[PDB]
Amino acid sequence: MKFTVEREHLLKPLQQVSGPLGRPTLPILGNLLLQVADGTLSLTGTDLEMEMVARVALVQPHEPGATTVPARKFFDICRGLPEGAEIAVQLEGERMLVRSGRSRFSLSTLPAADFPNLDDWQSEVEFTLPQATMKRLIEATQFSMAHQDVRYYLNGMLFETEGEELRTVATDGHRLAVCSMPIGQSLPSHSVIVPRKGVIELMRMLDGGDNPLRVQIGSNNIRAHVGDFIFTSKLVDGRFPDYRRVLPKNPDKHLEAGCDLLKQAFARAAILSNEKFRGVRLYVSENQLKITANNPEQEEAEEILDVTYSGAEMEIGFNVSYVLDVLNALKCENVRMMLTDSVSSVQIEDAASQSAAYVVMPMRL
């Protein structure tokens, strides 16, 4: 194996493939697979559940072959080299030698034959969509995912195809987020759970260019194709909850308010809320919302806002962190809070769009 590549053509691909890799349990998991074949350098990083592949064209003389080298060490060397540095790489048995100017580097290798290989799988549904659409879908729901839960299925994100739309669903049991976006393609119905790190990697590969994203989904796998990068991940088997049964059936009390004004009022009030439970009180009356928070230290905050509201008065408690999470994810001018009573969930949406909806459970305080 032999290749010479300019620093900047190797740098970003190296960062991408290293994504799925802190403390590797076994030595080979800390390594990247390098392959030179048909004038192309393929790089691969894995964690047994997912793979990130980068393909790099070779304009300089090269020789076929494959080896694995430490990801972090090889990335650090290339990054450390000066801009425009020519990086000559050759496999020499047990070591891979890296040369650039009068800089010399020798890396430990493990056989390419020993590198983990995710089994082949048959695609069942395929569609293309803009990178921006995928970014929107992930950023709207990502925060609602559970962290290291025993209910493994909640630690991921549901991906749903229905009609002309692609949909994401995330919930941690306490609060729910759901976002739908049209893609202009007739789709069958699949409901697959994408793991936590898979959601991160999907988000990582969107460089904000106009390169379309090609998505393939199977019974047990998902694949995402952006530019010269191919991401494959195994899916999480389980029974993910339906969002249609979590959405409030009867929201009779609709409140409309400025998103940023609601956000900054909640943020100021949060300062004096209970440090563990993060509870804020909401009193809603005609065209006005009052936000109050108190902690065991006997401290009190109060905020008063002009809103649009015609319904009956009610008092309701919320975990302020959940509300602030929703409002930061919406990033719009006007927000809509769909209420029922003090013991039922709220539905929070963008006032101008039904494409995203949020459900937060009420709180006793």
Ligand X SMILES: O=C(O)c1cc2[nH]c3c(c2cc1Cl)CCCC3
Q: Mark the segment that binds Ca ion (CB under 5 A) among 131-139, 223-231, 238-246, 270-278.
A: 223-231
Q: Which of 14, 34, 53, 56 binds Ca ion (CB under 5 A)?
A: 56
Q: Mark the segment that binds Ca ion (CB under 5 A) among 105-113, 188-196, 271-279, 321-329.
A: 105-113
State which residue, 282 or 359, has the beta carbon closest to ligand X.
359
- Partner interacting with residue 262 (select from its own copies, Ca ion, ligand X, none; CB below 5-8 Å by kind): none
State which residue, 250 or 298, has the beta carbon closest to ligand X.
250
Give min distance, CB of 27 to its own copies, in A.
9
Output the residue with the shortest Cβ distance to Ca ion. Answer: 227
Helix runs in the chain, H state only? 7-18, 71-80, 131-141, 196-204, 259-270, 320-330
| CA nearest neighbour of 330 among 309, 362, 352, 345 | 352
| CA nearest neighbour of 281 among 343, 348, 364 | 364
Q: Binding of ligand X at residue 141 (CB under 6 A)?
A: no
| Residue 245 marked as a ligand binder | no
Q: Which of residues 290-349 bind its own copies (CB under 8 A)?
A: 297-305
Q: Which of residues 98-137 bind ligand X (CB under 6 A)?
A: none
Site track for Ca ion across 151-180, x = CB under 5 A: ------------------------------
| Residue 23 marked as a ligand binder | yes
Q: Which of 155, 216, 221, 345 binds ligand X (CB under 6 A)?
A: 345
257, two tokens: 């308010």
Cβ neighbours around 254 below 10 Å, total: 16
Q: Binding of Ca ion at residue 57 (CB under 5 A)?
A: yes
| Residue 72 marked as a ligand binder | yes
The 8-class DSSP code of residue 252 comes to -
Give min distance, CB of 267 to its own copies, in A.
6
The 8-class DSSP code of residue 323 comes to H
Q: 208-218: string of b/e by CB count within 10 Å (b at 16+)?
A: eeeeebebbbb
Q: Which of 73, 136, 190, 204 binds its own copies (CB under 8 A)?
A: 73
Give min distance, CB of 107 to its own copies, in A.
6
Sign of CA dihedral 65, 66, 67, 70: positive
Q: Binding of ligand X at residue 193 (CB under 6 A)?
A: no
State which residue, 39 or 80, has the beta carbon closest to its own copies.
80
Q: What radius of gyration do the chain's Cα atoms show?
A: 25
Q: Which of 187, 246, 261, 332 binds ligand X (CB under 6 A)?
A: 246
| Residue 309 marked as a ligand binder | no
Sign of CA dihedral 257, 145, 153, 17: positive
Q: Binding of its own copies at residue 91 (CB under 8 A)?
A: no
- Return contacts of 21-27, CB within 8 angstroms, 24+ apart: 21/45, 21/47, 21/71, 21/72, 27/110
Q: Which of residues 156-215 bind its own copies (CB under 8 A)?
A: none
| Residue 322 marked as a ligand binder | no
270, two tokens: 């949060």
DSSP string, 41-104: EEEEEE-SSEEEEEEEE--S--B-EEEEEEHHHHHHHHHHSPTT-EEEEEEETTEEEEEETTEE
Q: Binding residues for its own copies, per CB under 8 A?
A: 73, 76-77, 80-82, 95, 102-108, 264-265, 267-268, 271-272, 297-305
Q: Binding residues for ligand X, per CB under 6 A?
A: 171, 173-176, 241, 246, 345, 359, 361
